[PDB]
Amino acid sequence: AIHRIRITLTSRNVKSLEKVCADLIRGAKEKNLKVKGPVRMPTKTLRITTRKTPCGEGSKTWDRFQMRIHKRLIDLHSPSEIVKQITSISIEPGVEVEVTIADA
C-alpha cells in the first residue's frame, strides 16, 4: 504494498513541464494507476533590478531581470505497489524532479 507517492516537477519553462505532466500521467493511465490531478503551484518570480551602467554616470537607467520558476505536483496512488511498477523517469534537461512518499 500500500503505497501513495508524490512526484513534484519544477523548472524555468512551461513547455517542458507541460509535456512532462502530460506524458507521465498518460503513461499512468495506460498503466492503470488512478491519478490525482496535476496541481500547479503559484509561480515564483525572482526579480533582480540593477543599474545598467558599470560606472554610475548616465541617466539612472535600471535593468530588471526575472526568473520564473514553475512547479507541478502529481500524486500517484495505486492499491498495489508503485515503485516496482513505475521506474522510468523520461526527463529532459532543464527540469528537476523529486519523488517522495505520503510519509514525507
Binding site: 525572482l46 526568473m67 520558476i69 526527463i91 529532459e92 534537461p93 528537476e96
Partner: protein
C-alpha cells in the same frame, strides 16, 4: 528539508554552475573550436556535453584531455565520484555558430591576417 536549500537558491546555484562551467570551458577550449555546453542533470548523475568543432582535438591522446577535464570538473565542484560524465559533441553547420566564427576570427587576427 533542512539539508537541501530552497528552490530559489537551488535554481540560482544551478545557473551559477552553468555559467562557471561555460566560462571555464571557454577559457580552456578556445583554440579547439569551442561552441557551447549543455548539462543534463538527474538525481542519479549528471552529463556534460561540450558542443565543439574539433572533437578529435578536445579529446587528447586516447581521451587524455577529456579525462583531465572530467577530473577537473569532478574536483572543483565536488560531485560524488562517477556521478558526472563528459561527452564531446561535434556541432553541425559550424558557420551558424557565432561563438565558433568569432573564435576563428580571433585566431586569424592573432595569426596575422589583415
Amino acid at each position: 528539508m533542512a539539508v537541501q536549500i530552497s528552490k530559489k537558491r537551488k535554481f540560482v546555484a544551478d545557473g551559477i554552475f552553468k555559467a562557471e562551467l561555460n566560462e571555464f570551458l571557454t577559457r580552456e577550449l578556445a583554440e579547439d573550436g569551442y561552441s557551447g555546453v549543455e548539462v543534463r542533470v538527474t538525481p542519479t548523475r549528471t552529463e556534460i556535453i561540450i558542443l565543439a568543432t574539433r572533437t578529435q582535438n578536445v579529446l587528447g591522446e586516447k581521451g587524455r584531455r577529456i579525462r583531465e577535464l572530467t577530473a577537473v570538473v569532478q574536483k572543483r565542484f565536488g560531485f560524488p565520484e562517477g556521478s558526472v560524465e563528459l561527452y564531446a559533441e561535434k556541432v553541425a553547420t559550424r558557420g551558424l555558430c557565432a561563438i565558433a566564427q568569432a573564435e576563428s576570427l580571433r585566431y586569424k587576427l592573432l595569426g596575422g591576417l589583415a
